[model samples]
Target: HPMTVAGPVGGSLSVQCRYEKEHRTLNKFWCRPPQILRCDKIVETKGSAGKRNGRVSIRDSPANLSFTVTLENLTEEDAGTYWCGVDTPWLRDFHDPIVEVEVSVFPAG
Candidate 1:
């Protein structure tokens, strides 16, 4: 299923990604759509800990089987469809997009 989130252009937003139990031990990624096969990873969570990647940051918790992706300094360019993916060890560099996050950015008062 697809999820949509809205925020002001100057504000920031976060997308909480919940994954299956099997993916808890796997690597996860946040990327742009249309080229999931060769998607551009904005943030990658290979570790069980939290990390930051530029304006994009991720909190990967294997214990909870969920991750939270935070994008800061929101702009018009930040509005798009982002995919939550899990890198399958069985596919050799291939990942499966489990969630679709549609970000909507609007003007602030």
Candidate 2:
């Protein structure tokens, strides 16, 4: 199953991700299209080479082993397809699916 995020141009947006509990030992990743070919951009919020900028944050939650990715300063151009991927030792390959993010812009009324 996939998660959904929604917001107006000036509001905050959050994307939640979850995976099979049994597969937790596997490596998880976030990928967008037009990638540098045969490579996935892993979401590492700390230290060098991370995706975290002023508008992104990886939330902390242990009870569910799930995390939330939030993007502020939203804009219509922010809409795109994102994917949550998992690579397992038993599977021998990565499993990925398209995640659709839609942002709607409307009047304040």
Candidate 3:
């Protein structure tokens, strides 16, 4: 499934990602695609802290078969396409679905 998330600059937001039970033991990651074969990993369950650069945090709930990613102190440069990927060895050749995110600095109050 595809999703769109929006947030204001300097604010925070969260995204929920779900996967099949069979993939629960697989490593999961969140990243922004920079090119056809490259991704800028923001966070991954296997990372040392599961949070990176004080800007992104990811939590995995294998029991629930899901994970959530949070982004803080948003910036205009943060708006982009992000993807949830599972390190399934058999499907390593395929790129999975992605989520679209948009951030705005100005909004009517």
Candidate 4:
């Protein structure tokens, strides 16, 4: 499915997305598209330890079968599609794209 969120130019946004309950044991990660990373990976959670990067972070909940991604210091450049998905145990170079977040940032006008 697709999720769309909007925030002010300087505001922050966090997104929570769900996954298959049965796949709760699997690891999860977040990424962006179009010239981002090897597969556009931002942060991945091995546990609930709270994985974080410069202006972004990822957190996962096994019990809840869900994951959250946060982007700080929002700018127009931060607006785009993000991927939050379950990582296949051995698929280090790839992951299942469970959800796509379309984040939009206004000019704060």
Candidate 5:
């Protein structure tokens, strides 16, 4: 099932992607849709000494069998469908599930 996440514009949003114990050492990534099919990697946890890229950060915890992705300074444009992917070599065509993110810019109080 896809997960829904929401955050206010100009704020930060964090989401967790859980994986089975067997996928612990697999390469994991979080990316936006459309471009994801082309492997437009945004934040990847494996082999990344620096877990951050600009406003995005990804942290992998094999012990916990999950990873966390955080996007900072969210804007309306940032709202969209994202995917948490695992690179399984055995599967020639593999795509992970989706995580819908919605960023709303509320009027200032």
Candidate 6:
């Protein structure tokens, strides 16, 4: 399960993605709820070729098979439900089995 923090004003939020094995590195995207807006991709571990510029980062940790996504420059409208997804080649769909993020930036003073 992935964990995310609903960052407050001027604060940063971090989302963590964990997996069991080295899944097929087809396409990874971070999307927000309602309209399904995608967050940027920071980094890739295995075979990521044509992915776009994202704000999420993949950490090389030896303990867990996971990656950390950091979203900075918090704003009030940035609040929503975010998700991590991987595209399946054979099925031609995205497999999202992690936790969902709920971001809520405080109103600016």
How much is 65 displaced in model 2, in angstroms?
A: 3.0
Task: For residues 4-108, write the lDDT of model 1, one tens digit per residue.
Answer: 988888789999888888889777888887453557677877743336777789878888888889898889999988888877766455555789999999998
Regions of model 2 farther than 4 Å from truth: 23-28, 34-42, 45-51, 87-95, 98-109
lDDT for each residue of candidate 2 in 38-69, tens digit (9 for 90 to 100): 33443533323255656655553435865566
Compared with the true structure, what per-residue lDDT tens digits does model 5 show for residues 1-109?
4777877778888888888888898777877654434445677776352468889898889899888888898777877777777777564354655343433444223
Listed in order, each prediction's TM-score against the native is: 0.86, 0.61, 0.77, 0.82, 0.78, 0.59
Q: Give per-residue lDDT, candidate 2, residue 79.
A: 64
Question: Best-fitting candidate, measured by TM-score?
Answer: 1
The alpha-carbon deviation from the true structure for residue 14 of candidate 4, after best TM-score superposition, in angstroms, is 0.9
1 against 3, candidate with superior lDDT:
1
Candidate topping lDDT: 1
**Candidate order by lDDT, highest to lowest?**
1, 4, 3, 5, 2, 6
> How well does model 1 score by local distance difference test?
0.80
RMSD of 3: 2.9
Cα deviation in Å at residue 101, candidate 4?
A: 1.0
Ten-residue region with minimum lDDT total, candidate 4? 33-42
Q: Model 2 — which ten-residue stretch has the worst lDDT?
A: 40-49
Candidate 4 global lDDT = 0.77
- lDDT for model 6 comes to 0.53
What TM value does model 3 have?
A: 0.77
- Across 24-104, the per-residue lDDT of candidate 3 in tens digits comes to 887677887547764556788875336555788888899898888888888878777788776665545555543444333
Higher-ranked by TM-score: 4 or 5: 4
lDDT of every predicted structure (CA atoms): 0.80, 0.53, 0.71, 0.77, 0.71, 0.53
